[PDB]
Design a protein around this ligand. Structure first.
Ligand code: NA
Ligand code: NA
Ligand code: NA
Ligand code: NA
Lengths: 249, 248
């Protein structure tokens, strides 16, 4: 069985004082065993050393982004090899905000994933459709195309988690149902089985990155093809511990 | 007289061991007084706390970029308020690599500069033309347009340094002459005098960010409108201390 996965994306938030409070709360948390759930927290770049130095060793740290290739003359960017040097094991790549606001193309995301994996990082690779795409019946075309841009560029899926983000249902007031989430995760896994291998389809975690009303995480987690959550604002709050606890059963 | 200014842009380089070696070499350096030269060092975001905690207190730290507005739902971005919280006093904005590779527009850079200043940061604001623009005779048209996008959004220039980057003469194998540098810096200052004020033109440092061969920084620093340097790869090396010494 795939190990349930909960990632916390802090986004562009945090102060030294807020980080200390979040980390102390996570360090005091009593959650399901390492065998039941894998937990990753993703602070901004400037707090990565602080969080890695202070967080419980059974929770893992992710950067929110890295550069597409080897470092060098790329003012403002952080390379995968820098993250490896700082003992940051994970990175989030292709988040909806970077695809939309920072205009990161599916091919650019794919090249980042492949480079990160080559340096030995583990990757949360994000995909998802807009409202226009959803309403046109294009959800499965769009999610398969974003996944194919990554698949075409990687040589190994072992250290990849895919995060599905229904962009129309993230902080818009619209919420996708469990059935809607299950349908996309099932079709995506079926895509991996036909286009990469049955083994990769069976072993790759596909986590849900859509907005969820309080108390509705266990109904989503219990869907057959949903393997956990990529969490936004709740990752800054004690509620994140209740999302980790949804891994139980 | 405007105080000579030397910025060191590490770009996307560094490891914890390399950072320790660069910072130790800077800390042992014997350079002209604080009255003669202002020195700023700019590591990647992940080394900002480490460099600020270990660097000599008379050298200052800059981030290489920040976000255009208040933080929030901007995965992978670092806000100006985050830099203030970590006591990072400077930021580089509009670097040629961000305008070219990351497609940052003049208006985007302008909005960043205005936001950074509003949070109390000091800004190295970068401008510069491409090969095609230079060959067309458009250098000053382009540099004035980039500067206008910032001027239109900024009321107080006290905490701004302008860096001119001849993009065609940065790691291309082409080296711009001191006369080419002085011509752009003079015409940019004349633009500032007409479009902001005589006082802002007189007091704003305009530093040079073009490639320079070893031993040739004093010929550039002694130009009337060149107030220092924004340094690339030499900022990782002992040579950076020889560039600060050009202030004498
Ligand atoms: Na499940
Ligand atoms: Na470009
Ligand atoms: Na002049
Ligand atoms: Na001078």
């Amino acid at each position: 069985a795939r190990k349930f996965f909960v990632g916390g994306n802090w986004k562009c938030n945090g102060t030294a004082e807020e980080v200390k409070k979040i980390v102390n709360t996570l360090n005091e948390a009593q959650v399901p065993s390492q065998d039941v759930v894998e937990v990753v927290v993703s602070p901004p770049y400037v707090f990565l050393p602080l969080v890695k130095s202070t967080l419980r060793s059974d929770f893992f740290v992710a950067a929110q982004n890295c550069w597409v290739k080897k470092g060098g003359a790329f003012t403002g960017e952080v390379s995968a090899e820098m993250l490896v040097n700082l003992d940051i094991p994970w990175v989030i790549l292709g988040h909806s905000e970077r695809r939309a606001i920072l205009n990161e193309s599916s091919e650019f995301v794919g090249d980042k994933v492949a480079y990160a994996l080559a340096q030995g990082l583990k990757v949360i690779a994000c995909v998802g459709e807009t409202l226009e795409e959803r309403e046109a019946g294009s959800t499965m075309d769009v999610v398969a195309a974003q996944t194919k841009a990554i698949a075409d560029r990687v040589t190994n899926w072992s250290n990849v988690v895919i995060a599905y983000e229904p962009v129309w249902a993230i902080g818009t007031g619209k919420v996708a149902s469990p059935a809607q989430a299950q349908e996309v995760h099932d079709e995506l896994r079926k895509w991996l089985a036909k286009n990469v291998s049955a083994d990769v389809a069976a072993t790759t975690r596909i986590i849900y990155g859509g907005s969820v009303n309080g108390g509705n995480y266990k109904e989503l987690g219990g869907q057959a093809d949903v393997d956990g959550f990529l969490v936004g604002g709740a990752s800054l709050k004690p509620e994140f511990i209740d999302i980790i606890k949804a891994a139980e059963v």
